[PDB]
Amino acid sequence: ETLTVHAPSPSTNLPSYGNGAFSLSAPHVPGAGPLLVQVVYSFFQSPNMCLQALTQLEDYIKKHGASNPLTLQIISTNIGYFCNADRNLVLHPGISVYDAYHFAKPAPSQYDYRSMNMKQMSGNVTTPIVALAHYLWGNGAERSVNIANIGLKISPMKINQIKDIIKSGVVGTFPVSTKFTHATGDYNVITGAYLGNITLKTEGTLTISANGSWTYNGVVRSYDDKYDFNASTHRGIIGESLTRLGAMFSGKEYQILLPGEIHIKESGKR
Ligand SMILES: [Mg+2]
């Protein structure tokens, strides 16, 4: 019968992340000055800022109680901080996750989910927690992320181009047109967590040379129209955090849209 967490709103949001009691913390580096500024800037670009945040939420529940009102305030506020930052990243592309999280207007503690929530997610490291947001509070509404933002790394050796073990190469030219399943969770802990396994389509050329070396020059887009956000679809360590949290609190399954197209070129040797 699970617990409800109040959506982020000025009316209920705590004044700061962790209400002061805990914080996002970079790795330790000796020194002072602008050096330390770089350290926190790069830490907000790491997937570890997302894992730390989730872990610190999980840790606080264990220590204080899932139904403790303050815990419930903390889940809501903290997620909202992520929701606000991810909003800044969508509305100001190519800016730093740090500056997105810390942009003073609008105030991050004044984030209002009901009026501010967006279909579009950035695909940056903030997105997994925002994906949790939309489960908690989205009411099965549809979301979206561009495939150009999910940090795709293709390894043609895992596709249908692997049927080059036929040694036929060269050339040089081999037309490729295939659908394939791609496990983002295998290498990308951000994307794996909320998208997990996706189905992709690729058209392009495979260039194998006389000495076993090969290049695949092609285009990738989503094969399936949509993907389900539920516990069975989460992949990787962060996905596991999402699953444990989502079981504990009330929410609704939704679909995520994956539009757009990328260009890849990937080489190797037999
Ligand atoms: Mg790190």
Swiss-Prot record:
Pfam families: Colicin_M (PF14859)
Renumbered ranges of motif TonB box: 1-8
Signal peptide residue numbers: none
UniProt keyword annotations, A-Z: Antibiotic, Antimicrobial, Bacteriocin, Plasmid, TonB box
Biological processes, Gene Ontology terms: defense response to bacterium; killing of cells of another organism
Gene3D superfamilies, per the entry: 1.20.1440.280, Colicin M, catalytic domain
Record's miscellaneous remark: This colicin requires TonB for its uptake.
Function: Colicins are polypeptide toxins produced by and active against E.coli and closely related bacteria. This is a calcium-requiring inhibitor for murein biosynthesis; it causes lysis of sensitive cells accompanied by murein degradation. The target site is possibly the cytoplasmic membrane.
Descriptive protein name: Colicin-M
